[PDB]
């Protein structure tokens, strides 16, 4: 009725702070893993050049 309740009450703030920090850490890790994937595709100029060669020009 008296002791354990008081110590739980004393615990509450630190645990709340640590859990908030942990959630912020999770969000930070989520953000840090995001990278934009710029792909490179075969230039169509080569395709045009091949087309010209096939024509025997």
């Amino acid at each position: 009725d008296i002791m354990v309740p008081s110590f739980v009450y004393n615990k509450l703030p630190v645990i709340h702070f640590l859990q908030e920090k942990r959630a912020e850490q999770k969000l930070r890790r989520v953000l840090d893993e995001t990278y934009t994937e710029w792909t490179e595709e075969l230039d169509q100029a080569h395709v045009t050049d091949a087309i010209t060669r096939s024509l025997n020009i």
Partner: protein, 48 residues
């Protein structure tokens, strides 16, 4: 009566690099058109 001429000597065919009109179509094909000009000059120098 000195030397007249070297019939063996021949003036090399002075090549001219083809020039394309500066339109957007040229920019998209700049590399391709440049390759054609290089091929044309190589053909002129060697002959065919």
């Amino acid at each position: 009566r000195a030397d007249e001429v070297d019939y063996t000597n021949l003036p090399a065919p002075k090549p001219q690099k083809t020039v394309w009109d500066d339109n957007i179509e040229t920019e998209v094909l700049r590399k391709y058109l440049d390759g054609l000009s290089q091929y044309d000059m190589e053909e002129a120098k060697y002959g065919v």
